[PDB]
Design a protein around this nucleic acid. Structure first.
Ligand code: 118
Ligand code: MG
Ligand code: ZN
Ligand code: ZN
Lengths: 98, 465, 1338
DNA sequence: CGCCGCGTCAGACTCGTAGGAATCTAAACCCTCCCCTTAGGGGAGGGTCAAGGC
DNA sequence: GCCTTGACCCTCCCCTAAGGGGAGGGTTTAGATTGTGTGCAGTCTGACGCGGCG
């Protein structure tokens, strides 16, 4: 099985999973450990934002690759915003300070 | 208390009351009835500022003779027009007035339970009584800011005298400097007191008789309320015994109980003991009505109207007996022939009776895979389509540069490219002061050139859609 | 951009300012036209439009008007994405309590009001009143009532007092109280009642009140009056294929709240009786509680399928919450997987990738490349070219993947060599091809495993995949510095078969010119590979300044070694190939090649070894047959000669000569002995049993048996398994642990019985079941270690300390288990050590001890070096590069910016699956040395010592300690000090069931200190007639007698207590109960006579208990301070003991049960730390009494005791990192103008950098103590709430951070992983540094 | 002060397949609003087809 | 080339006379009846912290 792009799930908007769904592969919790033991910071930042979960970056990256420009512009993932909403719904005031 | 269950906490606080006997409910209903008429008595001799029935009998103008409906209203007012002629004699509290207006009460006692008609006459003074109250609040929010003074001499003689401001002479009498420490503001006291004195003008009566008999009118409206309360509180086991046959139908037990209690509170308000029946026989109707109305309005995620609920229930009842009789489940043809409805409607009804599945439904051998994991977002655009859109925009921008600038501005205005809106011929010729027809001429020029094969095969590449 | 994250409580105005309108009814959507109903839960006027740039009615469209609000339907014309951002609210008709701040222990409401939880949970259910105002009455604030007492107070006092019921009462209490006045009145009224039991709770309440005062919150916001509503797209209602719908559970939980609040708003207008309004308020409270946290305050509300509904709190916490499932690991694009197989022709930097996988994973690259060459007009034609698989597509693919690395990964990823980068080679077929030398770091093999493939996209990711992760940079291990690419199974067998020798081989005796001629003779068929010949050989060396010098000779060798020598590179000696090679010799070859020459020659040499091993293993022809398993001919007689013995030991039981237990325990060993005899006969008949004859007659040599050859070379097998193939199987255990009596006397070549097979299945299933249920414990331990160690990074270059730790070999338990060389290689010297004379400097005193320095240390003999450590580093927020030492996978000083915590945790955790879960003799001759001693001469001409804690060492030729023991107290030393004794000589003699305690000086013994009726009996041995006043047990106790615990003392010719030389000492000691004393009265003794006597789990659990800092259940008792010991006031709960300084105060005395045998008598003088009893020591005591280095040394030695017992090699700074992380907290003793409290717990670095500034401009600092927390208690006590919340116990962490008003600065690795940023380690370290500089700019 | 009871928290990773989702009774009367019915009319707004004036 | 006429043409919405059919919403109903109920689930072990009683 192999996947270049495909369908994303409804709430979190990350790739689906499985071969019957044409899904991605889980980059789990203990693979991030190996990658930050090597010190490979850019590989990790692209595994988290523009390959999985960043909505504007993952479509900007495609049009950079087609034009022969291997560069990314990462933003904030979507599941972090989901988390902030579900914590605010408990009566707790959590926010990002600048 | 060693328990946290609210159903037990309810059934415990509910058991400290005793069930009534046939005489108890009758002599409770009797006082419910006579308090609400003591009130209607107390409303009688209030001044014309009330909405009194002078022409309510004419406002509206068991099938009673019209001559009977026109005449017996003439007894009460035939005595009333001559009775309250004595409103002047010896102040406002004359004894002939009390005697013959409680004789009007002797007349009034004939009547019994009625719609809000009676309500809208006592409201006649609500909109007028609390008014008086709030106005003497105004004076106070105009006195405490400037001077401090002991309230229980001032407001006591305020309650007592109400003749004129002469009672303020009872403030200097103790010879303490808080007497006239007030400066230049007492005319605001006189402002608000004088406006309530012209209210007294329109009422014609002093406050300490109106509020005096409102003290006893409030006795009836509370003595009916208390008896209604202890008529309700003695019958909660009836609600609990009825509401136990509606379980497992979309609501929980305490929800059904609290829906039945709102119906019991209406059965208590509509009862009539004279007809001779017990209370259970009349109350069960309202209790069941409240519970049934709340099951059909709540207890479904997507709400169905009541007529569709009854159609669904009837079709279920028919298919039950046809299944018992045939030994099989009937096809919609065999249901349409007996229900006597067009078969397309029987097909339409059968889709509306399904409740949504939970997104936490375990799908597999394990319980870590759920139904909501395999649900895909359908409103996203594929990146091949984004790239195609941008490439087509660039190709069009390049082909639109070959021909004239003024002759491309008209195409940009005509199809809305790079602009906030599309335009029409006359509003484009507005800025060109060109005729209705010349725009179409130059458009048939541009669209004729743009498909010449020297130009077209760059744009033709896209139309394979 | 942003720099921090805050958290607090939310006021009602804050919750109203997040929202876009109020939800008023439970309507979701219309049942015929599935459009959102107005004012319901999916309303399009509140939450936004359901299509892009369209109102609901259809009046407006088409993006001309973008900000207009339709007048018919109220929907504004905008994009539908906003249905993921907008919130709503619900106005409650009566206030309710937030369940988190009421029922998460300790409750914050009960802690703020100082009320029990029972009183509050009774007022909240309308079940009792509570007094809010006292007025002028006997009743006071927070007094609790019942209905009758409320009526009494009403009719007695009237209006003056105030009493309420329900959450309105509690809100009035929380709203009326004053915090500053209350905390200041807790301040000056604590010093009188600063007793500990009150001290803890008073300071806790003080810091809570102060937190509320400083944070800005208000205490009444813990009671809810407005409720927020989540956006609709995060709790969707969605159609499936078939018309069926699917929904979230929050909809079910919101509808109940809405339509129980509406009913209360109705009942408050009908003016119902209060018995009904109370029931409504209770139901509303229960519904809101089940919406927030479902199963916390009662029974869990379930759905129509009898499962509990999920709540807002179950979507955040747990193994399947947001944190661990969607933020710390994700699903990714551009990735695939497949089965793996072996390709033996590949280079070390190469993998084989199928064509179809590569065509799918590389599609946008191919589209762009196609439309750059003009081969396709638009991207949509490129798609169809690729989909048809034309011939030019396969030529574009070949130049796209040229110089594009690919990451391969196999699960579970136990350490960082589980992900590596390769260069792909396109193949046909569908399986991935892997190089045979990397299957050991992956733990992979080809019985069906599968692997995952990932593609880096950007330029920086490609640079990092080439420089950091490529498989040709990863030859060394990061746990120990050893090579990881060693050849395993057939390389070994081929190289071993080609470098063996044989007698009378064809072509023996010749003399050849070089290796080329030997090869040309072997290929031609004239010589053999095992033939003994003489060859001229040229070899190189380097002693010049980087140059090689050659020299030639004639050597005696075989053909095969001369053929192998053509592979070895220039600069290595011939003596490496002149052996018969095995796995150990090949690992030595690769390691010396790495030390002398470097990296690239090593990676070429490894490939050449692999190729030639495979080739010659193929040519050998090795096989396995049934006749290769040779059973010795004298097993059948060993078996009968054990069966006869077991019969004649049964018949000594049938006639009553032996017990049953001893009968069983004798049969056990008379079968074990016969098993050992059989196994050694078998192994000797197999190992050299070759009789090959020579030019005149026979002789012996090593065997060429196939099984022996693959066992002896180290390719596959061992002796313990040939024992089962050809010997006998042995003794089997029950599932209980008991051993069955009759063993298995058969082997696999002969076949078992039904019964032997049945009893052999028990142990098989036991092992198979232990494996699966041990892997979980190992994984959980690794996760806790990673969480405590994740934020530690090499920050600086040199801190500049002079502290350190003293490294010596470990010699206990027998011979030297760990030399000094294996414990200082790579470390940095702390002081200028000198070879055993004086001023033998080798050091600028900062010296990376590489191999040459270790050789210099070993040519002299030095056995102690002071080195540097991380547990003593002076840098705060990190370590320095010199305290850490060498990068164990690169071979040089560590680089600044390295993530050493994750490496430490992974290195300790990875091997955890292999863990299991009467007289002194002397071997060799040398001096004898004693320490911690105090001596006396004996009456029989021997040495005795009166020390308990002495040590006896053996000194070598040069003075390096080779063995060390300790003697028991009271033992008589057979020979004295300073002796050069040979082996086989005993030096001390002690009893195996007794130890004596001796007198001080020759004096006259008196029976004193004991009477008749005491704990003494007059029990005399009636047969032999010897008795002193013997001490008794507590079964023969006379309580009135123990007024003075008996002891027979020594007197002068004065009749009074004897002088002791040096001090005015009482010469005799009082001994605890049940003492054996038979010394005569009136028969006096000499100094040192027998006066009294003394009669008498490893694996993963132990490692977890050491890192968690458990307390033993029989902890030894140590001396708090130094002083003269004595028994105290004797309050008889259980015994009392005191010590007294010679100069200082002594208020310290405490409890000891009489079961705890004391080893310190009332005349002893003890120093700080020594034991008063025996038992396993407790690490908190070791940290309190002795310093930090003592607890460090104890922990690292007790951990390495478990790993070495199994053969696992882990370096020692990996444990020091964890020990440093367990020591981050300090506790204040005396503040002294330091802005700290007097028993608050602070971070150690805060105290340090505060005292460094107070002391700067001449002021008095603070004094503190160190603390020791376990790993999971120190993970949760860190100063960032996001790491702690994502580790464990999310509810407690979030409630405490909310009421405290904390913030987070995003300095660890996990904080930046959560929000998708560059971590502060590695190639991201510079970036953050620059950002930090702007923090100083603004 | 010390012991015991009781309540809360935790228990490895990555892949595969497998259709549909499970009881459950109100009935007569009134009202208002919305679209439907034949065979074409009427207008509003926006386009198209020849012909010349210059 | 650069504009002005006078004809023609199209689609979309609303309208006719006398009711018909349906969807979705309101209201009362008088022999008496007065405390749940599932043929529940209850089911693991170890460490730790705090309250309640001697
Ligand atoms: C099962 C059980 C009772 C009723 Sb009904 C009723 C129904 C039709 C005609 C007359 C009576 C009832 C009353 C109000 C609301 C809902 C249902 C009923 C009422 C009181 C006593 C006995 C039966 C219906 C089905
Ligand atoms: Mg395998
Ligand atoms: Zn609209
Ligand atoms: Zn340092």
């Amino acid at each position: 099985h192999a996947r270049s792009t495909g369908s994303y799930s409804l709430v979190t908007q990350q790739p689906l999973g499985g071969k019957a769904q044409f899904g991605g592969q889980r980059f789990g919790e203990m693979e991030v450990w190996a990658l930050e033991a090597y010190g490979a910071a850019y590989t990790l930042q692209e595994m988290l934002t523009v390959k999985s979960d960043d909505v504007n970056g993952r479509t900007k990256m495609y049009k950079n690759i087609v034009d022969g420009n291997h560069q990314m512009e990462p933003g904030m993932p979507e599941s972090f915003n989901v988390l902030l909403k579900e914590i605010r719904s408990l009566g707790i005031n959590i926010e990002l300070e600048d | 208390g060693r328990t946290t269950d609210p159903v037990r906490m309810y059934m415990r606080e509910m058991g400290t009351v005793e069930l009534l006997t046939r005489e108890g409910e009758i002599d409770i209903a009797k006082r419910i009835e006579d308090g609400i008429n003591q009130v209607q008595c107390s409303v009688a001799e209030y001044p014309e500022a009330i909405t009194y029935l002078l022409e309510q009998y004419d406002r509206v103008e068991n099938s009673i003779d019209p001559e009977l409906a026109r005449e017996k209203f003439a007894e009460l007012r035939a005595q009333y027009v001559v009775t309250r002629d004595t409103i002047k004699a010896k102040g406002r509290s004359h004894a002939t007035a009390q005697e013959e207006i409680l004789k009007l009460s002797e007349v009034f006692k004939q009547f019994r339970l009625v719609p809000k008609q009676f309500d809208y006459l006592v409201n006649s003074m609500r909109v007028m009584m609390d008014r008086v109250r709030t106005q003497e609040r105004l004076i106070m929010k105009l006195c405490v800011e400037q001077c401090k003074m002991p309230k229980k001499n001032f407001i006591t003689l305020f309650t007592g005298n109400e003749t004129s401001d002469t009672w303020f002479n009872a403030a200097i009498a103790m010879n303490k400097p808080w007497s006239e420490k007030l400066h230049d503001v007492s005319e605001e006291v006189h402002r608000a007191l004088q406006k309530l004195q012209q209210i007294e003008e329109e009422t014609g009566l002093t406050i300490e008789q109106v509020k005096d008999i409102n003290r006893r009118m409030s006795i009836g409206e509370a003595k009916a309320r208390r008896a209604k309360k202890e008529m309700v509180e003695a019958n909660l086991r009836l609600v609990i015994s009825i509401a136990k046959k509606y379980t497992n139908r979309g609501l929980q037990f305490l929800d059904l109980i609290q829906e039945g209690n709102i119906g019991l509170m209406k059965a208590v308000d509509k009862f009539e003991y004279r007809r001779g029946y017990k209370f259970s026989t009349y109350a069960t109707w309202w209790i069941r009505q409240a519970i049934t109305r709340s099951i059909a309005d709540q207890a479904r995620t997507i709400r169905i109207p009541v007529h569709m609920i009854e159609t669904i229930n009837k079709l279920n009842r028919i298919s039950r007996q046809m299944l018992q009789e045939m030994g099989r489940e009937p096809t919609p043809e065999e249901l349409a022939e007996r229900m006597l409805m067009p078969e397309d409607k029987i097909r339409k009804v059968l889709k509306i009776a399904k409740e949504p599945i939970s997104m936490e439904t375990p799908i597999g051998d394990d319980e870590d895979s759920h139904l909501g994991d395999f649900i895909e977002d359908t409103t996203l655009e594929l990146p091949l389509d984004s790239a195609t859109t941008e490439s087509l925009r660039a190709a069009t921008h390049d082909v639109l540069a070959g021909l004239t600038a003024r002759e491309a501005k008209v195409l940009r205005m005509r199809f809305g490219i790079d602009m906030n809106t599309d335009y029409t011929l006359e509003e484009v010729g507005k800025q060109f002061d060109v005729t209705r027809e010349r725009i179409r001429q130059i458009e048939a020029k541009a669209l004729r050139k743009l498909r010449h094969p020297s130009r077209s095969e760059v744009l033709r590449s896209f139309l394979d859609d | 951009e942003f720099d921090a994250i805050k958290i607090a409580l939310a006021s009602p105005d804050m919750i109203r300012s997040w929202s876009f309108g109020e939800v008023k009814k439970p309507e979701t959507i219309n049942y015929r036209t599935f459009k959102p109903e107005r004012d319901g839960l999916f309303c399009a006027r509140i939450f936004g439009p359901v299509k892009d740039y369209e109102c609901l009615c259809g009046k407006y469209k088409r993006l001309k008007h973008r900000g207009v609000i339709c007048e018919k339907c109220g929907v504004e014309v905008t994009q539908t994405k906003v249905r993921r951002e907008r919130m709503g609210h619900i106005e409650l008709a009566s206030p309710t309590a937030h369940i988190w701040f009421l029922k998460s222990l300790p409750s914050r409401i009960g802690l703020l009001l100082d009320m029990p939880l029972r009183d509050i949970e009774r007022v909240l259910y309308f079940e009792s009143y509570v007094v809010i105002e006292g007025g002028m009455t006997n009743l006071e604030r927070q007094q609790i009532l019942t209905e009758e007492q409320y009526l009494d107070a009403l009719e007695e006092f009237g209006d003056e007092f105030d009493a309420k019921m329900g959450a309105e009462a509690i809100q009035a209490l929380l709203k009326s109280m004053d915090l500053e006045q209350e905390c200041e009145q807790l301040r000056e009224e604590l010093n009188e009642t600063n007793s500990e039991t009150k001290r803890k709770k008073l300071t806790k309440r003080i810091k809570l009140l102060e937190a509320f005062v400083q944070s800005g919150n208000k205490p009444e916001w813990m009671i809810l009056t407005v409720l927020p509503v989540l956006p609709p797209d995060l709790r969707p209602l969605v159609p499936l294929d078939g018309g069926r719908f699917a929904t979230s559970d929050l909809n079910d939980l919101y509808r109940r709240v809405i339509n129980r609040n509406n009913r209360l708003k109705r009942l408050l207008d009908l003016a119902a009786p209060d018995i009904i309004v109370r029931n409504e308020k209770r139901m509303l409270q229960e519904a809101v509680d089940a919406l927030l946290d479902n199963g916390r305050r009662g029974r869990a509300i379930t759905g129509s399928n009898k499962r509990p509904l999920k709540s807002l709190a179950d979507m955040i916490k747990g193994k399947q919450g947001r944190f661990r499932q969607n933020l710390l690991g994700k699903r990714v694009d551009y990735s695939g997987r497949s089965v793996i197989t072996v390709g033996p022709y590949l280079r070390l930097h190469q993998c084989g990738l199928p064509k179809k996988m590569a065509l799918e994973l590389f599609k946008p690259f191919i589209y762009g490349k196609l439309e750059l060459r003009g081969l396709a007009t638009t991207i949509k034609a490129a798609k169809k070219m690729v989909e048809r698989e034309e011939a030019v597509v396969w030529d574009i693919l070949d130049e796209v993947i040229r110089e594009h690395p690919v990451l391969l990964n196999r699960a579970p990823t136990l350490h960082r060599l589980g992900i590596q980068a390769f260069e792909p080679v396109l193949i046909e077929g569908k399986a991935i091809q892997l190089h045979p030398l990397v299957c050991a770091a992956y733990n992979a093999d080809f019985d069906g495993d599968q692997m995952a493939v990932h593609v880096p996209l950007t330029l920086e990711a490609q640079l990092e995949a080439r420089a950091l992760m490529m498989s040709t940079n990863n030859i060394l291990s990061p746990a120990n510095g050893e090579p990881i690419i060693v050849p395993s199974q057939d390389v070994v067998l081929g190289l071993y078969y080609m470098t063996r020798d044989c007698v009378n081989a064809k072509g023996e005796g010749m003399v050849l010119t070089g290796p080329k001629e030997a090869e040309r003779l072997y290929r031609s068929g004239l010589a053999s590979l095992h033939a003994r010949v003489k060859v001229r050989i040229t070899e190189y060396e380097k002693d010049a300044n980087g140059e090689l010098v050659a020299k030639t000779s004639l050597k005696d060798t075989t053909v095969g070694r001369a053929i192998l020598w053509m592979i070895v590179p220039k600069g290595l000696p011939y003596s490496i190939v002149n052996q018969a090679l095995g796995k150990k010799a090949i690992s030595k070859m690769l390691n010396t090649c790495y030390r002398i020459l470097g990296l690239k020659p090593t990676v070429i040499f490894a490939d050449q070894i692999m190729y030639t091993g495979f080739a010659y293993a193929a040519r050998s022809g090795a096989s396995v047959g049934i006749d290769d398993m040779v059973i010795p001919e004298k097993k059948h007689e060993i078996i009968s000669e054990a069966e006869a013995e077991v019969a004649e030991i049964q018949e000594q039981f049938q006639s009553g000569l032996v017990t049953a237990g001893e009968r069983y325990n004798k049969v056990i060993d008379i079968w074990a002995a016969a098993n050992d005899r059989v196994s050694k006969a078998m192994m000797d008949n197999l190992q050299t049993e070759t009789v090959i004859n020579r030019d005149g007659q026979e002789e012996k040599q090593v065997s060429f048996n196939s099984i022996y050859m693959m066992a002896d070379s180290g390719a596959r097998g061992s002796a313990a398994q040939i024992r089962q193939l050809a010997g006998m199987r042995g003794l089997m255990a029950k599932p209980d642990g008991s051993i069955i009596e009759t063993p298995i006397t058969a082997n696999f070549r002969e076949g078992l019985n039904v019964l032997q097979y049945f009893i052999s299945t028990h142990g098989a299933r036991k092992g198979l079941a232990d494996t699966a249920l041990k892997t979980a414990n190992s994984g959980y331990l690794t996760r806790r270690l990673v969480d405590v160690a994740q934020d530690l990074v090499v920050t600086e270059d040199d801190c500049g300390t002079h502290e350190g730790i003293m490294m010596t070999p470990v010699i206990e338990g027998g011979d030297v288990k760990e030399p000094l060389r294996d414990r200082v290689l790579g470390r940095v010297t702390a002081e200028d050590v000198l070879k055993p004379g004086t001023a033998d400097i080798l050091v600028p005193r900062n010296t990376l001890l590489h191999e040459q320095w270790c050789d210099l240390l070993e040519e002299n003999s030095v056995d102690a070096v002071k080195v540097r450590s991380v547990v003593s580093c002076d840098t705060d927020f990190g370590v320095c590069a010199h305290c850490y030492g060498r990068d164990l996978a690169r071979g040089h000083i560590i680089n600044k910016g390295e993530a050493i915590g994750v490496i430490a945790a992974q290195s300790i955790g990875e091997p955890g699956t292999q863990l299991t879960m009467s007289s002194i003799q002397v071997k060799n001759k040398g001096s004898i040395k004693l320490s911690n001693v105090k001596s006396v001469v004996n009456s029989s001409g021997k040495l005795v010592i009166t020390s308990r804690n002495t040590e006896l060492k053996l000194i070598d030729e040069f003075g390096r300690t080779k063995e060390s023991y300790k003697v028991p107290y009271g033992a008589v030393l057979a020979k004295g000090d300073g002796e050069q004794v040979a082996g086989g000589e005993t030096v001390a003699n002690w009893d195996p069931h007794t130890m004596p305690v001796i007198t001080e000086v020759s004096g006259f013994v008196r029976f004193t200190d004991m009477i008749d009726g005491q704990t003494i009996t007059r029990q005399t041995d009636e047969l032999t007639g010897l008795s002193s006043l013997v001490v008794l047990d507590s079964a023969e106790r006379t309580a009135g007698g123990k007024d003075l615990r008996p002891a027979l003392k020594i007197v002068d010719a004065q009749g009074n207590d004897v002088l002791i030389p040096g001090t005015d000492m009482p010469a005799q000691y009082f001994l605890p109960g049940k003492a054996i004393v038979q010394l005569e009265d009136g028969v006096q003794i000499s100094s040192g006579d027998t006066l009294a006597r003394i009669p008498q789990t490893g694996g993963l659990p132990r490692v977890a208990d050491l890192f968690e800092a458990r307390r033993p259940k029989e902890p030894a008792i140590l001396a708090e301070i130094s002083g003269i010991v004595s028994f105290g006031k004797e309050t008889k709960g259980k015994r009392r003991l005191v010590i007294t300084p010679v100069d200082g105060s002594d208020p310290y005395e405490e409890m000891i049960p009489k079961w705890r045998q004391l080893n310190v008598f009332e005349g002893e003088r003890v120093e700080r730390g020594d034991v008063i009893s025996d038992g396993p020591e407790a690490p908190h005591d070791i940290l309190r009494l002795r310093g930090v280095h003592a607890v460090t040394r104890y922990i690292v030695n007790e951990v390495q005791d478990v790993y070495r017992l199994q053969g696992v090699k882990i370096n020692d700074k990996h444990i020091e990192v964890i020990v440093r992380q367990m020591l981050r907290k300090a506790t204040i003793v005396n503040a002294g103008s330091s802005d700290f409290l007097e028993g608050e717990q602070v971070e150690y670095s805060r105290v340090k950098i505060a005292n460094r500034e107070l002391e700067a401009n001449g002021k008095v600092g603070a004094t503190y103590s160190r603390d020791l927390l376990g790993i999971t208690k120190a993970s949760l006590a860190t100063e960032s709430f996001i790491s702690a919340a994502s580790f464990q116990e999310t509810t407690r962490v979030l409630t405490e951070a909310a009421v405290a008003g904390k913030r987070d600065e995003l300095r660890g690795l996990k904080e930046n992983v959560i929000v998708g940023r560059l971590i502060p380690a590695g190639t991201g370290y510079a970036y953050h540094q620059d950002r930090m500089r702007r923090r100083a700019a603004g």
